[PDB]
Chains A and B, each alone.
Chain A
Amino acid sequence: HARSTGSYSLVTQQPLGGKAQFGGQRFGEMEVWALEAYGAAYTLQEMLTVKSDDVNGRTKMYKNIVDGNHQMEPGMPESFNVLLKEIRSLGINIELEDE
């Protein structure tokens, strides 16, 4: 069972899980630790941002791969913004800062 670009999930713009719902694998937590253990960084950055979460980066990635380029555009993971809207949905002020 595998996947190239299928349905994204609703509460978080993330790939789904399972074979029945046509989803993909889970790059788990210890696998992030494994990539950190190697000196590789770009693999992880396109992993949990471009290939997984950020909608603008992955649509421009799709256009770049069909247009011959190999280039990421990081932006911001959407799930981070979901986390921030939940913590801001508490009684907590948390923001982003200077250039």
Chain B
Amino acid sequence: EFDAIKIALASPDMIRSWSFGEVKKPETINYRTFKPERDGLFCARIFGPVKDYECLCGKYKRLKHRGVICEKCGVEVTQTKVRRERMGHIELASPTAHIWFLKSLPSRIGLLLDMPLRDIERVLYFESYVVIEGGMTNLERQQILTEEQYLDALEEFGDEFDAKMGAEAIQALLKSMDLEQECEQLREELNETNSETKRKKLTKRIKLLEAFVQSGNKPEWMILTVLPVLPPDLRPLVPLDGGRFATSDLNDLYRRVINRNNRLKRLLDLAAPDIIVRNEKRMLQEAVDALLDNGRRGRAITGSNKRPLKSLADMIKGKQGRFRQNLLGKRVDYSGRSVITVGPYLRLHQCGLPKKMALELFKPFIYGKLELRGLATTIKAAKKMVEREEAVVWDILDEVIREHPVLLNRAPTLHRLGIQAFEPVLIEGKAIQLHPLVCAAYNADFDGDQMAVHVPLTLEAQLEARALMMSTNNILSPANGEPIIVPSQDVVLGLYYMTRDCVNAKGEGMVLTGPKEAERLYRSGLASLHARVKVRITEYEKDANGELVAKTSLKDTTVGRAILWMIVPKGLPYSIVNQALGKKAISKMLNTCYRILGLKPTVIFADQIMYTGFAYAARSGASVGIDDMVIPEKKHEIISEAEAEVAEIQEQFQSGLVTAGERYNKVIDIWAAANDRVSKAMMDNLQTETVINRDGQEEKQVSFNSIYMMADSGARGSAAQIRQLAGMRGLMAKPDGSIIETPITANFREGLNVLQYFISTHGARKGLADTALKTANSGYLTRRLVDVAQDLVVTEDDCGTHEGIMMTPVIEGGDVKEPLRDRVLGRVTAEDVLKPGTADILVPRNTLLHEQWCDLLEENSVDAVKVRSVVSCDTDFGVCAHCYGRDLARGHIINKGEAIGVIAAQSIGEPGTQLTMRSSIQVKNKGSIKLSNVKSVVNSSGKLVITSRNTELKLIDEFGRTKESYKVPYGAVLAKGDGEQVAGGETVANWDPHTMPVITEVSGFVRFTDMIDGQTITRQTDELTGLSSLVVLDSAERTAGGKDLRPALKIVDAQGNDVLIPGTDMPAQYFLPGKAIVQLEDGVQISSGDTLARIPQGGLPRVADLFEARRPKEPAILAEISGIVSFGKETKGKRRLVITPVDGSDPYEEMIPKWRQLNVFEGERVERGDVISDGPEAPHDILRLRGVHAVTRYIVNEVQDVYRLQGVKINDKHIEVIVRQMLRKATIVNAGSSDFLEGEQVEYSRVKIANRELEANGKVGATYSRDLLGITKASLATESFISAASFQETTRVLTEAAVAGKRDELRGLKENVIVGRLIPAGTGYAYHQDRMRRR
């Protein structure tokens, strides 16, 4: 129908064009009759008629008189819908300052007038004055005054000078200002003046001004003159059940405003003295303030008791304003909800549903089939028929259901498996039966959860539901390729019981030709369920080009496992079933079934798993009794010896040997050791409980005790919970978080005392409150992430770029945590993979990679894979297809359109419930030695020390890859070197971290070069030996004279001349910091690498701080420019550091709060982006120094470390596209041959499509700089403003879009959701292809 939404400022002519009458009188209704009162808020002759097509006096109740107004009462007879459409207005005697431009911070009239806000509030609230056109006076133009100063201005200049007060004077200020002269003056002062705050405020002022001249607005429109009023139906008069009216407070506000304005007109009729009308106009300004935004000015007005009331800003802001209450979430007809129940006989492509709800929902369909069969032609008798529920209507209902899907929906919708589709099957009763496996997708137990049904009406929606949102179409998850149809608890227990090997029972040691007679034996009872038996199976391998080959043999197996074999489809091998079949096992069974046999065998295989699992879990009888938990008899002795040991440590404290904290730590360690002893004891005594005969004497096997199976299957709980049910439940924390010194010795199979139960009550309530507030911050995180990656839709098929990030598996300095395969898997390469058979084109450079190709990659042992990424995608207004690779939860590549930002935000913020909130290296594996950023020399001992700070140790294995990586400090003691081989566990990496090294490059004499004794240094004598050391102190405790007398240690030869360092001509001068302990004295020659001085010394909000990209509490700063380093002026607050390039220009300095333990010396040459003081790594400096790819690598490795530490895996693509939408904006360096301003901030895609064609012609492009905004910030500064009106505030956004006149072209999801057309994401993206192809 239409296009972009234009916004601007209200003009008084536009206001008078909008309205259809002045409300001159503040009445509301008659309240004696129900008729409205003339010319009040509920006015007929302004707004329209109460009832449809009936005049107020009752003249023309006929449709024939449509259009003609009355003359007895003057009512335009039309519908009553026009009382929803016509606005109104109030003529105002006083011009009025609009409140948002007053107090937006930044105030638009505030910085527009180049005037502080305090004087503006003093002018508006009638307690000051201001100058309008002083001229030839002693008074400046912007100058504000007071009353005695007003008497002065009456004395000296009661003539030609003039001045006013209040908002009328602000209107005169806005009328009395040229804009082009202000533009010229501010541009000149930008070219001339050289102060940073002046540059900032003037560039904001000139941005506002030249944007405002670009806008079609006048500044005095920011001062209200005529107040537009809402239609009456939007502020309606509702009576309660009684003789009153409890309405909205808008009507009370307008009542106050009209009374105030009419009494002000009457007090401009009687010509009052001016102090009273100052107070009266102040009350009117207050009234308009309270009408627009109550509470934004100080102490707010109220309604009922003292409670602050609702205004327009409350109608648009906040949670319960219209965007989050009535636009993005709307109540919807054809809906229902009930308590869920199971009905296990169902297949997963269907759900149960009550008959009465189905008869409630599908009423128009039943009406349609009723008058199609013609059992009742009309509709009212038909409605009585469906009210009666006669004999024919149920067959009609079974007609209209049979192939019509519905949507099922648990209310806390975290991720996109919160809503699915099902084909209903009518069930008696009153509760929704629901297929059980799918419950694990909803995270919905049967404790009383209320799932809601919706019904699609139209034919396209039925095809969307059956074709996209069906349960069959979703068996993998958009988190990652773990199938979400993992079975939950009962059926996995039944399977784990069904495939296990007892050593002897009936049928042990015979042979069987087929699994059919195995089932025939088990249903007979003439055998065990499970016994190691050689049978014949037959498997079907499709090793050829999609062609079945049947092979067979005898396999040793168990009998129930053979029974399970009659369920698996053809292509799976036998070895998938020959194990115990835990939860991980059956999950990867379904995964391999999906990877080999497509879809339909996997779905029917899941159905048959569920049926047979429930059947043989019923045949099992896996109960639990009190004798099913076995207390180890060692526990009495273990607690006794632990009590003896803590008595020993306590009596060693009362003798005075140790401290209290040492006692605390040693006692808590011996308690933890005894706890692990109890753990080992109970785990042994469970898992080898079965010691039985074998048809011979004796044999142990894995135990058929119940709770060991319910823990070993992985059904519910793990070693922690079964540890608490048998052994002691360790230690619990106090509310301060200090771990409690006297642990919980008892266990739940025995009794508990009062006290340990009380301690665990502290722990449990702490856990519950943390889950509550954790779900709170998780919800707010999900909301921010869906409104920061709102706009992003895959729109193209290739962008044809070579760039991409690098992929290596993750190592912190322990095991290789997540291997190269899973990060590479499903993503499309950037450049070709080069095996170390160098120049072997192993894969083509721009191809998709699935799991067979990943096995080809892994067995060829590839160490680093260059791959395309979403942040490096080069797509205009979107993301290309091949940078996104496999759409996870499906097999193939992403289709053209299917938007990823929403599934990214959901798959990040979903496991937030499952999260938590609040020396020397012994190298492990065996391989050759590699170093990165290496610079080394051999010491006097023969060992190898490293003369570079940023050196990493890599351990090449026997394969060639990197399996171990370690952070080595500057100057470690290696027993081996590079180009060599170390053994498994041979100690090489060792250093002393407590002392920073002064290890020397060269050898020679150490004189006392620039070492002043008594003024710069001090002489401290070690009391333990007597061989002392010189001690250089800091900059403030000594005098200021020796502050510029630097400590130095310079190497000279046997002739005393300066030893020349190879590489330069500079000697070896070594500078020292304050608070050091200088080692040597005169007359000693040092070795290369010799110490010359003894130098002294995270949860969900971590995630939230990363996506905000905050500076931490102590930001680790880095080097801004390459070159040699040098110090500067001492302690003008900080210590300044100046890097001078070897060939470039020096003048950047960086202040350092020098209380930090710094890293760099004074004579070092470093790369840009190199560390100065250590600490947490700030993201913005990494972007503006290192690059885009390094900073996205940092964020993805940190947040993958968090989500992987909690063990719930998220694929990298979602995090990467969030990172892309973080840095969507940019900042301009130079204008170039384009027309952008220098300090203009503008988004990256806009300036990219700008300068892309400006290089395509003869002109030159421009330079930019991407700045890395937070998630909540880059949502705001967008092409749209309606998204930011939906997100987190309204006042700032709508003032900015008001002064911009920003023509809001839709371009995105939620904007197109508000206007209610199709979403340009999927089927709507094809629709918008068509409509954009029109224009």
- Chain A contact residues, CB within 8 Å of chain B: 1-6, 10-12, 14-17, 23-54, 58, 61-62, 65-68, 70-72, 74, 76-77, 79-83, 85-99
Contacts and interface: CB of A to CB of B under 8 A. Distances in A.
Interface in B477-491: 478
A12 B326 contact: yes
Contacts of A14: 326, 330-331
B357 A37 contact: no
Given A29-B329, A39-B464, A93-B10, 20 more contacts: A4-B363, A4-B364, A24-B335, A26-B330, A27-B329, A30-B413, A32-B1313, A34-B415, A38-B464, A39-B899, A41-B1318, A41-B1325, A46-B461, A47-B330, A48-B332, A66-B371, A70-B462, A77-B1314, A92-B7, A92-B1294
A15 B1317 contact: no
Contacts of B1298: 92
A94 B786 contact: no
Given A25-B331, A66-B364, A72-B458, A40 B465 contact: yes
Contact of A82 (B221, B234, B367, B460): B234
A23 B942 CA distance: 86
Nearest to A99: B2
B368 interface: yes
B968 interface: no
B797 interface: no
B5 interface: yes
B231 interface: yes
Interface stretch (B121-129, B142-150, B449-457): B449-457
B782 interface: yes
B782 A89 contact: no
Contacts of A61: 457
Contact of A40 (B333, B371, B1322, B1327): B1322
Nearest to A16: B331
Interface string B890-921: 00000101110011011000000000000000
Contacts of A79: 322, 326-327, 330
B234 A11 contact: yes
Contacts of A39: 464, 468, 895, 897-899, 1321-1323
Contacts of A67: 368
Given A25-B336, A48-B1313, A93 B458 contact: no
Given A5-B333, A96-B2, A72 B1315 contact: no
B1060 interface: no
A15 B454 CA distance: 14
Interface stretch (B222-230, B657-665, B973-981, B989-997): B222-230
Contacts of B316: 83, 86-87
Contacts of B786: 33
Contacts of B453: 2
B904 to A, nearest CB: 9
Interface in B926-984: none
Contacts of A50: 457-458
Nearest to B410: A31
Given A11-B234, A31-B418, A40 B3 contact: no
B186 to A, nearest CB: 27
B1250 interface: no
26 contacts: A5-B363, A11-B235, A15-B331, A16-B331, A25-B454, A27-B331, A30-B414, A30-B418, A36-B1319, A41-B1325, A42-B1318, A43-B461, A44-B1313, A45-B1319, A46-B458, A54-B1316, A65-B367, A65-B368, A68-B372, A71-B458, A76-B1316, A77-B327, A79-B322, A83-B322, A90-B10, A92-B8
B902 A83 contact: no
B580 to A, nearest CB: 37
B1105 interface: no
B503 interface: no
Interface of B: 1-11, 14, 18, 84-85, 87, 98, 100, 221-222, 224, 228-231, 233-236, 238, 292, 312, 315-316, 322-324, 326-338, 357, 360-365, 367-368, 371-372, 379, 407, 409, 411-416, 418-419, 452-454, 456-462, 464-465, 468-469, 478, 782, 786, 895, 897-899, 902-903, 905-906, 1294, 1298, 1309, 1313-1319, 1321-1325, 1327
Contacts of B222: 91
A36 B902 CA distance: 7
B902 A92 contact: no
A26 B337 CA distance: 10
B1323 A41 contact: yes
Contact of A3 (B8, B327, B334): B334
Nearest to B358: A2
B267 to A, nearest CB: 25
Contacts of B98: 91
Given A4-B361, A28-B413, A45-B1319, A35 B328 contact: no
Contact of A95 (B6, B238, B333, B337): B6
Q: Which of B8, B329, B895 has the most CB of A within 10 A?
A: B329
B320 to A, nearest CB: 12
A26 B902 contact: no
Given A37-B416, A66-B368, A86 B334 contact: no
Contact of B333 (A31, A52, A97): A52
Contacts of A86: 230, 234, 312, 315-316, 322
A51 to B, nearest CB: 5
A32 B1315 contact: no
Contact of B1323 (A1, A42, A88): A42
Q: Which of B222, B418, B453 has the most CB of A within 10 A?
A: B418
A36 B882 CA distance: 21
Given A2-B360, A27-B329, A66-B367, A42 B461 contact: yes
The 10 closest A-B pairs by CB, nearest first: A2-B336, A39-B1322, A25-B335, A37-B416, A41-B1324, A42-B460, A40-B464, A65-B364, A4-B363, A93-B8
Contact of A90 (B312, B454, B1309): B312
A77 B465 CA distance: 23
A89 B250 CA distance: 12
Contacts of B233: 10-11
Contact of B1316 (A3, A23, A45, A92): A45
A94 B7 contact: yes
Given A29-B324, A43-B464, A94-B7, A2 B337 contact: yes
A58 B330 CA distance: 15
B409 A31 contact: yes
Contacts of B897: 39
Contacts of B895: 39
Given A25-B454, A41-B464, A51-B334, A94 B6 contact: yes
Nearest to A31: B413
A40 B469 contact: yes
A48 B1310 CA distance: 12
Contacts of B329: 26-29, 31-32
Contact of A2 (B292, B357, B365, B368): B357
Contacts of B412: 30
Nearest to A35: B419
Contacts of B221: 91
A11 B461 CA distance: 29
B327 A83 contact: yes
Contacts of A54: 1316
A71 B362 CA distance: 16
A15 B335 CA distance: 10
A99 B2 CA distance: 5
B1314 A3 contact: no
Contact of B1309 (A27, A29, A36): A36
Contacts of B336: 1-3, 24-25
Nearest to A47: B332
A80 B333 contact: no
Contacts of B407: 43
B1003 to A, nearest CB: 68
A85 B379 contact: no
Nearest to B473: A38
B4 A97 contact: yes
